Design a protein around this ligand. Structure first.
Ligand SMILES: CCCCCCCCCCCCCCCCCC(=O)OC[C@H](COP(=O)([O-])OCC[N+](C)(C)C)OC(=O)CCCCCCCCCCCCCCCCC
Ligand SMILES: CCCCCCCCCCCCCCCCCC(=O)OC[C@H](COP(=O)([O-])OCC[N+](C)(C)C)OC(=O)CCCCCCCCCCCCCCCCC
Ligand SMILES: CCCCCCCCCCCCCCCCCC(=O)OC[C@H](COP(=O)([O-])OCC[N+](C)(C)C)OC(=O)CCCCCCCCCCCCCCCCC
Ligand SMILES: CCCCCCCCCCCCCCCCCC(=O)OC[C@H](COP(=O)(O)OCCN)OC(=O)CCCCCCCCCCCCCCCCC
Ligand SMILES: CCCCCCCCCCCCCCCCCC(=O)OC[C@H](COP(=O)(O)OCCN)OC(=O)CCCCCCCCCCCCCCCCC
Ligand SMILES: CCCCCCCCCCCCCCCCCC(=O)OC[C@H](COP(=O)(O)OCCN)OC(=O)CCCCCCCCCCCCCCCCC
Ligand SMILES: CCCCCCCCCCCCCCCCCC(=O)OC[C@H](COP(=O)(O)OCCN)OC(=O)CCCCCCCCCCCCCCCCC
Ligand SMILES: CCCCCCCCCCC1=C(C)C(=O)C(OC)=C(OC)C1=O
Ligand code: SF4
Ligand code: SF4
Ligand code: SF4
Lengths: 97, 314, 156, 110, 206, 70, 176, 169, 80
């Protein structure tokens, strides 16, 4: 049956975040748990991931850093926390990071 | 020892009401091509707690009520009648085994409109009073068909006892010989609890416009408890489950699943159709539901005589 | 001491409850109301933040002024604002509500909704995108989070 | 015995919840509000339609009270008489509904 | 229950657009026409551009005309989506509002890709259009229009054959043809009474 | 996707399973490992009171059989 | 050239009559609507995870205003006052004087972000590409006075967003 | 004091009757009558009449006093010494009667009443496998043919009469 | 008479169904052969005690024991 593929994909989602601690961390921070290819990261610590199999809009995302310019951003993430060189890539204005 | 039974009846009702609010929000979201709350907690599991605390620290309206007595008394009656309509429900053993539990439920449901009447009269707004009068008229007019349908269904049971209703459906479901009564009963219970497409008070003043946020939450919680109770009653009436006297958990799990499916069908109904007009639902009741209910009542009186299938009195 | 810790934790609890269940009312005046409707669309999904769609004025928390506030409409806006229960917040959407916008020098347009009601968050744009109004709502949530009501009550 | 204990428990839980819902924001000291229906001071217009549907409900409720003991009454030995009386009662219900129907009783609230 | 008199009091959004137009030039007065009907932006821009081009005795190039007609039809799709879904939302059906507002967001993406603004494009100007279409836009337009037939079919499935929906609309607001003509009605209000009139067919533009 | 409504439905299902299970367990515990006896008519109540009087413990669920007769 | 919506006569034979009456009594089209809403339940929703996921945009997007510089440190604005002349909302105030080395530079350049309608006429009336409408849109403020930009704020915005504004201009300048 | 439960309920019944019979306002009279009807249904239930008490709840309170309060809401537009005076004096005669009953365990006003608890009059036997009141009510379709006929005709005639007199023509 | 039924079944099917169900309910119990079974099932239910009769000497029909052959029989109920 084809439910086992879905359960196995959920288990690789648990394992791909480096264990249950990282899984719970990303679940309670980003409200999402799916894994994608790490496109890169910037000077402040934001990590940019992509997944081209998702539909247009979810195929690029950013996990924000926990400390930017001396401010604790573990729960207080901001949309204006992305530097411009990655701001152009994240908003799908270009194909090149 | 009995107070433990009372408490374990009445506290999960409030818990199920709060999670019914969460489930309805999420199911409507996923049915409208979006998501429900998933930010406040893991898949929105903390949304009812936050919403309850916010509503219980909100500023009161402090109205110029004509009567503070019935202004107090209307949520009292609403909550008491929402909680007291669970005690003869067999799960598979009722908390209070009543010989006439069905008619006791009918009496409580008929008594439930005084909350609407007193909430409408206590508020000084005349448009609120007019909305309350219209809601009361719709409620009693659907009480009529509730009573006729229940009377005609009970002729296959033989008594008013709710526990015998499991014994009757030991062979087959009661929706097989009484499906038109089942459809009319479902629509009448949908219009009984003031739900879409019959929730006219949300369409263009409610009966509780001047009520504070806390008492408004109490009224809404009573309404949701009424919804869950009615769906459990419908499941017991028409979709009776297999009850092993040595394992009651089988019946508990089975009717829990069926009643949850019926309540999800309520939420499914509420997001598919436009609302009725007032005269349109009055036409649907007095000119469509009532004659067929009377015809099926005569049919279900005269049928067990001609089939030699009178159910036992005891 | 113990009392400061207790009031700090209680303040965090009540601020979490208030900021995570913001029920908005929307003044559907002009273009910016169509953009508000587009933020309530499936793509941005205002409901998933605990922010319901079109709550009643008698039970809402945040009031959104999306459009132009004319002279014929301002007393009605003040009357609606006065009936809201506390804690009440106001978000100004678009240039017409911010400072008048295109019709600033008109004879029948109030130059900003801050001349009638107190305003907490100003969302710039004409119209500001659904992303921008969502950012303004989340910034309002951040503003509610860092409130210090119980600490102020304890210190006074 | 247990029933009135449960009734008292439900009543006191409801009144406890209502008391906490009322008097807890009373401990807040928010503000004092002056506040100086679409109709301003119009009298409630008396409508014969709502009274008519109320009285029709009351009369049908009375004939429902008459119809209620049918499950017990079906166990009688005199089955022909009980069947005839039951059919006559529901036929009188139908006739009253038809008389309300034909003489425009169910009009504008159909 | 029966309405005897209806008095619609308006003027709550009278901004005074015409005086401000009189105080500015034509290019400055174009966004005033952008903001007049805030669900039919490019149609109002096209009407203003057509009037100014008529007074200027000039005509736009053919590609600008085809772009104008294509975006006028996209604007018509946006307006009809908004009108039907808000009508159903006011009556009480709420699912098609979200269902078609997703496609509305897609059309807004087309507007933003061609002009830089989602709603008030200020794109159609006297003399043609401000900027050419970027490469790869018409493929996305083709895909969207390819799926929009099924979107209309699903809205029609939810709304048209429902008895509750048609009970609110079958005999409501019947207008005779002569009264529709005398009261100054136009468009769908004229066409619903049987009057065969259409400005794109009788007095055509570009 | 759609399977995220399932935690809320599961919590509701637990809260609806709780009262029936608690009622059945309380009835079985309080009545000596048997069902709560139904007394809808006065004959069944008379049997109840006779069994309570014959128990010798003033307790209607302590049922004595052939060990009592001579 | 025209078509007749809703001019279909109903058939009066027994087949059509019984079909319509069965549809009335058994509620067929209501089941159709229920079933299709159920089918729409089991689809993946179109919701993106803001702020971790952003909606798509274009290099022509008109957001926050900025003042650019030449690739030598010198600012591009030469105080020609075309942007304040073309501004349909009169949101731009410009005052100029010759500076120390005799260059024609502004001494005051204010843009009222509460008057501006974000129409992009200023960035297309500029002969030197000095004023631009950058791609930033998340700049909501808690105060009215924070939305009254002077020259220093706009120059800081340009220095902040140059690495994106220059790329957008490079991508779009062949369409102008 | 638990053996006097029906007596205490009767005291509450007559006290509610004094309260609503003072006529403070029609809506408050309706509320007092609803409370008195509930207490009287409690009296009937404690006497053994489950069906008749549930008829009182279903028809008198849930079906008819709703109509009374519904008509009261359509008149008597929303916003004394006499009301308080008669309430006080009715409470005084009621409690004087209670004291004279319980002090001497006998009383005479018009008939002679006894002050013992009302559990004494009950029957010491069982009814078998049925309830007596349910069989008595159920005999309406088998024995009360004439009663059914006259009651149904009176109900239909009442429908006709109400439709006749509210028309105005 | 024939087209009237078709017209009223095309126009008000709910009333046609109601009247048809009513007619079935009022003419079927007088036509079914199982009504007598309901009669003698209801009359053969032993609610109260079968009080014995004092044996004067002439009752051949009345049994002296429940298992005696004479007396009423419910084999028809056991088979049906
Ligand atoms: C509990 C189990 C599940 C129950 C169903 C739950 C899922 C389905 C939910 C459906 C949608 C609910 C929301 C909308 C509710 C409001 C609309 C509505 O219900 O309207 C009812 C509609 C209203 O009818 P109407 O308004 O369309 O009627 C037209 C009337 N005129 C022309 C005057 C305007 O239908 C009914 O009232 C019919 C009720 C059921 C009838 C059952 C008949 C059974 C068959 C009898 C025999 C037929 C053969 C002929 C005789 C043979 C004799 C031998
Ligand atoms: C279980 C369901 C939900 C139950 C309720 C919610 C759970 C939490 C209950 C306690 C919350 C905190 C107290 C109530 C809210 C107070 C908010 C507020 O306005 O505070 C400022 C107010 C007033 O503070 P103030 O003196 O600054 O006044 C501000 C208002 N002016 C200046 C106009 C007068 O604080 C209080 O009223 C204090 C109330 C008690 C504080 C906590 C005591 C211990 C509780 C445990
Ligand atoms: C219109 C009236 C229609 C029904 C008439 C009675 C039909 C019937 O079953 O009668 C036998 C029934 C019952 O007959 P029965 O033979 O079953 O009764 C045996 C005796 N008891 C009651 C002890 C079991 O009624 C009578 O015999 C007498 C009462 C009715 C007399 C006629 C009243 C007509 C009023 C017209 C105005
Ligand atoms: C019948 C069953 C009914 C079930 C009902 C409830 C269903 C949902 C259950 C809970 C689901 C998970 C909730 C998780 C909440 C968040 C927990 C958490 O980690 O909070 C962290 C937050 C900040 O922590 P901080 O120390 O600041 O972080 C810096 C470290 N890097 O710290 C804080 O915010 C402070 C601590 C918060 C702890 C919250 C724990 C959960 C509360 C749930 C309440 C209801 C529990 C069930 C009640 C009924 C059953 C007994
Ligand atoms: C004497 C000492 C005690 C004094 C009284 C205090 C009692 C305990 C009160 C709760 C705990 C205190 C701390 C409250 C939260 C503070 C930390 C915080 O803000 O955490 C934020 C975090 C979510 O972060 P967020 O900013 O929402 O980010 C969105 C994602 N980008 O939030 C989370 O992860 C979830 C936070 C959950 C908070 C706890 C659970 C709710 C409250 C449960 C108890 C009260 C209600 C019980 C039920 C009532 C009936 C419904
Ligand atoms: C504004 C005022 C306050 C408003 C809110 C509170 C009141 C309204 C909401 C609660 C309503 C409670 C209704 C109680 C009566 C319902 C009928 C009833 O008791 O039925 C159960 C049972 C009869 O069934 P049965 O199985 O035959 O009995 C056992 C036989 N072996 O009967 C029994 O088991 C009988 C048990 C002994 C007698 C119990 C008497 C109860 C107390 C009197 C009524 C209390 C309510 C008074 C107020 C009414 C509303 C104003
Ligand atoms: C004798 C059997 C037992 C009788 C007693 C039990 C009856 C049970 C059902 C009770 C129904 C009560 C209400 C009846 C009202 C009938 C009158 C009526 O409504 O007439 C008006 C209606 C035309 O409608 P209109 O005038 O427009 O009103 C607005 C709604 N459209 O007019 C119509 O639609 C036409 C209605 C009359 C013709 C109906 C014919 C049905 C035939 C079915 C097959 C035969 C069944 C066997 C019985 C013989 C019937 C003649
Ligand atoms: C003992 C008290 C328990 C908490 C009170 C009941 C649960 C809270 C309901 C709040 C609520 C929610 C979540 C809600 O989503 C909603 O919108 C439909 C409401 O009505 C406007 C509500 O009242
Ligand atoms: S700010 Fe712009 S988009 Fe918003 S209402 Fe004003 S003119 Fe319309
Ligand atoms: S975008 Fe338009 S309104 Fe804004 S400053 Fe530039 S020219 Fe003026
Ligand atoms: S148009 Fe350009 S160069 Fe001229 S004043 Fe404006 S910003 Fe400066």
């Amino acid at each position: 049956m084809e439910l086992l593929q879905v359960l196995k994909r959920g288990l690789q989602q648990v394992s791909g975040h480096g264990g249950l601690r990282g899984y719970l961390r990303v679940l309670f921070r980003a409200n999402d748990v799916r894994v994608g290819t790490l496109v890169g990261e910037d000077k402040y610590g934001n990590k940019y991931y992509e997944d081209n199999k998702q539909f247009f809009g979810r195929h690029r995302w950013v996990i924000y850093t926990t400390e930017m310019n001396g401010k604790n951003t573990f729960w207080d993430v901001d949309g204006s926390m992305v530097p411009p060189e990655w701001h152009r890539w994240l908003h799908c204005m270009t194909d090149d990071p | 020892m009995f107070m433990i039974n009372v408490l374990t009846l009445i506290i999960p009702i409030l818990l199920a009401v709060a999670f019914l609010t969460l489930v309805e929000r999420k199911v409507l979201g996923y049915m409208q091509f979006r998501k429900g709350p998933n930010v406040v907690g893991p898949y929105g599991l903390l949304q009812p707690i936050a919403d309850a605390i916010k509503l219980f620290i909100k500023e009161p309206l402090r109205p110029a009520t004509s009567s503070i007595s019935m202004f107090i008394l209307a949520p009292i009656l609403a909550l008491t009648l929402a909680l007291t309509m669970w005690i003869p429900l067999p799960m598979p053993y009722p908390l209070i085994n009543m010989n006439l539990g069905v008619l006791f439920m009918l009496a409580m449901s008929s008594l439930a409109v005084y909350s609407i009447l007193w909430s409408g009269w206590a508020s000084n707004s005349k448009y609120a009073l007019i909305g309350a009068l219209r809601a009361v008229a719709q409620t009693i007019s659907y009480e009529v068909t509730l009573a006729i349908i229940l009377l005609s269904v009970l002729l296959m049971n033989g008594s008013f006892t709710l526990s015998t209703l499991i014994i009757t459906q030991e062979q087959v479901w009661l929706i097989f010989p009484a499906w038109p009564l089942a459809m009319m009963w479902f629509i009448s219970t949908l219009a009984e609890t003031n739900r879409a497409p019959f929730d006219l008070t949300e369409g263009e003043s409610g009966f509780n416009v001047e009520y504070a946020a806390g008492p408004f939450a109490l009224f809404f919680m009573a309404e949701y408890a009424n919804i869950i109770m009615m769906n459990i009653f419908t499941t017991t009436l028409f979709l009776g489950a297999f009850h092993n006297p040595y394992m009651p958990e089988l019946y508990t799990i089975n009717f829990t699943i069926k009643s949850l499916l019926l309540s999800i069908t309520f939420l499914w109904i509420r997001a598919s159709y436009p609302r009725f007009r007032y005269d349109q639902l009055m036409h649907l009741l007095w000119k469509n539901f009532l004659p067929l209910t009377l015809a099926l009542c005569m049919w279900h009186v005269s049928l067990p005589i001609l089939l030699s299938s009178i159910p036992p009195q005891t | 001491s113990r009392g400061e810790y207790v009031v700090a934790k209680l303040d965090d609890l009540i601020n979490w409850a208030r900021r995570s269940s913001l029920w908005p009312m929307t003044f559907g005046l002009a273009c910016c109301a169509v953009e508000m409707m587009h933020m309530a669309a499936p793509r941005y999904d205002m409901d998933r933040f605990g922010v319901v769609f079109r709550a009643s004025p008698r039970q809402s928390d945040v009031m959104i002024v999306a459009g132009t506030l004319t002279n014929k409409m301002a007393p009605a806006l003040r009357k609606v604002y006065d009936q809201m229960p506390e804690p009440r917040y106001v978000v100004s959407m678009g240039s017409c509500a911010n400072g008048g916008g295109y019709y600033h020098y008109s004879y029948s347009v109030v130059r900003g909704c801050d001349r009638i009601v107190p305003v907490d968050i100003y969302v710039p744009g004409c119209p500001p995108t659904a992303e921008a109004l969502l950012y303004g709502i989340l910034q309002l949530q951040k503003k509610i989070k860092r409130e210090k009501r119980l600490r102020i009550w304890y210190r006074r | 015995m247990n029933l009135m204990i449960t009734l008292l428990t439900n009543f006191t839980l409801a009144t406890l919840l209502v008391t906490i819902a009322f008097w807890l924001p009373q401990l807040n000291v928010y503000s004092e509000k002056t506040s100086p229906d679409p109709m301003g001071s119009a009298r409630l217009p008396f409508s014969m339609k709502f009274f008519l549907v109320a009285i029709t409900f009351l009369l049908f409720d009375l004939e429902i009270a008459l119809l209620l003991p049918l499950p017990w009454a079906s166990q009688t030995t005199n089955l022909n008489t009980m069947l005839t009386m039951a059919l006559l009662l529901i036929f009188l219900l139908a006739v009253s509904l038809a008389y309300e129907w034909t003489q425009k009783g169910l009009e504008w609230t159909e | 229950e029966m309405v005897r008199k209806c008095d619609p009091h308006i003027g709550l959004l009278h901004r005074g657009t015409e005086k401000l137009i009189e105080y500015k030039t034509y290019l400055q007065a174009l966004p005033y026409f952008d903001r007049l009907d805030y669900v039919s932006m490019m149609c109002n821009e096209q009407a203003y551009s057509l009037a100014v081009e008529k007074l200027l005795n000039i005509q736009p190039p053919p590609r600008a005309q085809w772009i104008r007609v294509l975006f006028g039809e996209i604007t018509r799709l946006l307006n009809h989506i908004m009108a039907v879904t808000t009508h159903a939302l006011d009556i009480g059906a709420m699912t098609p509002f979200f269902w078609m507002f997703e496609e509305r967001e897609k059309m807004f993406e087309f507007y933003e890709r061609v002009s830089g603004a989602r709603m008030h494009a200020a794109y159609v100007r006297p003399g043609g259009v401000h900027q050419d279409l970027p490469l790869g836009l018409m493929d996305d337009i083709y895909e969207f229009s390819k799926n929009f037939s099924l979107r209309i079919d699903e809205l029609e499935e939810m709304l048209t054959n429902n008895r509750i929906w048609r009970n609110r609309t079958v005999d409501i607001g019947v207008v005779t043809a002569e009264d529709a003509l005398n009261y100054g009605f136009s468009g769908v209000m004229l066409r619903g009474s049987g009057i065969q009139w259409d400005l794109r067919k009788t007095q055509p533009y570009d | 996707m759609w399977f995220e409504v399932l935690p809320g439905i599961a919590v509701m299902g637990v809260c609806l399973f709780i009262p029936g299970m608690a009622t059945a367990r309380i009835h079985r515990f309080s009545n000596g490992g048997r069902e709560k006896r139904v007394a809808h008519y006065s004959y069944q109540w008379y049997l109840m009171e006779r069994d309570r009087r014959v128990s010798g413990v003033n307790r209607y669920y302590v049922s004595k059989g052939l060990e009592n007769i001579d | 050239t025209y078509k007749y919506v809703n001019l279909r006569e109903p058939s009066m034979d027994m087949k059509s009559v019984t079909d319509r009456a069965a549809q009335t009594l058994l509620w067929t089209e209501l089941i159709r609507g229920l079933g299709m809403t159920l089918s729409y339940l089991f689809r993946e929703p179109a919701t993106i995870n803001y702020p971790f996921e952003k909606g798509p945009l274009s290099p022509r997007f008109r957001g926050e205003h900025a003042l650019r510089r030449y690739p030598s440190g010198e600012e591009r604005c030469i105080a020609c006052k075309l942007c304040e002349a073309v501004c349909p909302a009169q949101a731009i105030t410009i005052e100029a004087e010759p500076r120390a080395d005799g260059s024609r530079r502004t001494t005051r350049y204010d843009i009222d972000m509460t008057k501006c309608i974000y129409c992009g006429f200023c960035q297309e009336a500029c002969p030197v590409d000095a004023i631009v409408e950058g791609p930033n849109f998340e700049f909501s403020t808690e105060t009215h006075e924070e939305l009254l930009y002077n020259k220093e704020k706009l120059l800081n915005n340009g220095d902040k967003w140059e690495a994106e504004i220059a790329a957008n201009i490079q991508a779009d300048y062949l369409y102008r | 004091m638990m053996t006097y439960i029906v007596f205490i309920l009767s005291i509450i019944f007559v006290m509610g009757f004094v309260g609503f019979s003072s006529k403070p306002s029609p809506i408050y009279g309706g509320l007092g009558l609803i409370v008195s009807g509930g207490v009287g249904c409690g009296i009937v239930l404690n006497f053994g009449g489950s069906f008749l008490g549930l008829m009182v709840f279903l028809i008198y309170l849930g079906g008819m006093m709703v109509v009374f309060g519904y008509t009261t809401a359509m008149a008597t537009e929303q916003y004394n010494k006499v009301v308080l005076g008669t309430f006080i004096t009715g409470l005084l005669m009621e409690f004087l009667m209670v004291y004279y009953v319980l002090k001497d365990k006998e009383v005479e006003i018009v008939f002679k009443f006894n002050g013992m608890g009302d559990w004494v009059i009950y029957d010491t036997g069982d009814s078998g496998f049925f309830s007596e009141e349910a069989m008595g009510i159920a005999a309406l379709y088998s024995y009360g043919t004439w009663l059914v006929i006259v009651t149904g005709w009176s109900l239909l005639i009442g429908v006709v009469v109400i439709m006749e007199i509210t028309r105005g023509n | 008479v024939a087209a009237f039924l078709k017209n009223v079944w095309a126009k008000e099917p709910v009333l046609v169904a109601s009247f048809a169900i009513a007619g079935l309910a009022v003419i079927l119990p007088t036509l079914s052969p199982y009504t007598k079974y309901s009669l003698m099932i209801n009359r053969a239910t032993p609610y109260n005690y079968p009080v014995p009769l004092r044996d004067d000497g002439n009752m051949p029909d009345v049994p002296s024991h429940p298992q005696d052959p004479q007396g009423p029989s419910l084999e028809w109920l056991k088979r049906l």
